[PDB]
Amino acid sequence: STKNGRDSNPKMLGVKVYGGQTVTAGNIIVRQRGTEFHAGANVGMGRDHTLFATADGVVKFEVKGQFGRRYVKVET
Amino acid sequence: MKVQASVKKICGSCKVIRRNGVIRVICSAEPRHKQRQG
Amino acid sequence: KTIKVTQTKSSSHRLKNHKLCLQGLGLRRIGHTVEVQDTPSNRGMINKVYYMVSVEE
Amino acid sequence: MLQPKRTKFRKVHKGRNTGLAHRGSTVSFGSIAIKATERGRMTARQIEAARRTISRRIKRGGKIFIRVFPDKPITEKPLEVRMGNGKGNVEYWVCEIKPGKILYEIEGVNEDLAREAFALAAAKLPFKTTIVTRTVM
């Protein structure tokens, strides 16, 4: 008899809106367990590290800063 | 006569010959070196 | 400015996008020949199914 | 019987053996070496047998470098057991061999004796081999 045989339910993480798409305020952009992407301009962060848009515009990804962090922002 | 898959010269008096599509070894000195591939 | 495409093999067992490329060029059966505009958009469909069409350029 | 002192995991997936050996295909430690020409598996007992043959033939007059280590465990079912009910038990350890991999190197002997020892050793291995010597590049 094996001592294995368990696993957890899926969580459906990942990027929901890619670069170049238009969003409205409140749209969820990234679902993530940790902070792989950071919040840029017009982007807010939830209590579970979810990134969402706070204004209408176009999504844009970039790499910025002295630590080389990945940022996502919304251009109005 | 030795019958084996591998046949080789043993001493300087062994000769490798071919008869009717069969490879044989015949020795001038000692009869016990006689071989036939098979 | 226009090119002629002829279907030379069957399309029954091919991939779905290959069948759709044939339908988007307008070929309907073996031996059918059509005349289409010479544009990159048409050339892409032709190049995807190169192995079962013949082009009179 | 070479085998790792400890391992992070006990059982590993089968995998597939593909490709060539671009790494580990150059004579580095000695002057003459034997290398594989086709792919396969090499067991610890085979490694030990070939090493014993080479050492016995050359009479420990030089130094032998072994460049293969069996870090992969292989399992088997206890026999008369049906399918299912978990993975088997570790029985032996192997090394995966790709074409071009060097198995043994010899330092400090004459080429005739090294070649005769390598010919003695090659009869114990389950794949074809060949002899190479060091070169500038």
């Binding site: - | - | - | 060539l20 050996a21 671009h22 295909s25 290398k35 020409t37 074409p99 071009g100 190479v132 500038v136 590049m137």
Partner: protein, 97 residues
């Protein structure tokens, strides 16, 4: 002077994976020549000539001459690629000297 290799130009339609495989099937060897003040030059060499040259030891430390028709280059061997299992040379690099 002492070491001379006859070569022919290797063009863009002769560069690539399939082209190189066809060249080696025809028993030829691709080579590249780079060095100070000039752009790289791609050439093709004879397998037998390359093997004969590599057999000698002075080839790796002496200036060699590569002749493509009228164009002549003086170079040193820099890098060599061999097949992992058959030891056949597969590609050569030459640094201008």
């Amino acid at each position: 002077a002492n070491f001379v290799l006859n070569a022919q130009a290797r063009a863009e339609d002769k560069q690539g994976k399939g082209a190189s495989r066809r060249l080696r099937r025809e028993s030829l060897v691709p080579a590249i020549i780079y060095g100070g003040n000039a752009e790289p030059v791609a050439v093709t060499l004879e397998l037998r000539e390359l093997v004969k040259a590599l057999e000698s030891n002075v080839f790796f430390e002496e200036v060699v001459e590569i002749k493509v028709g009228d164009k002549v280059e003086n170079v040193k061997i820099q890098a060599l690629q061999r097949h992992p299992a058959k030891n056949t040379p597969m590609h050569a690099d030459f640094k201008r000297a």
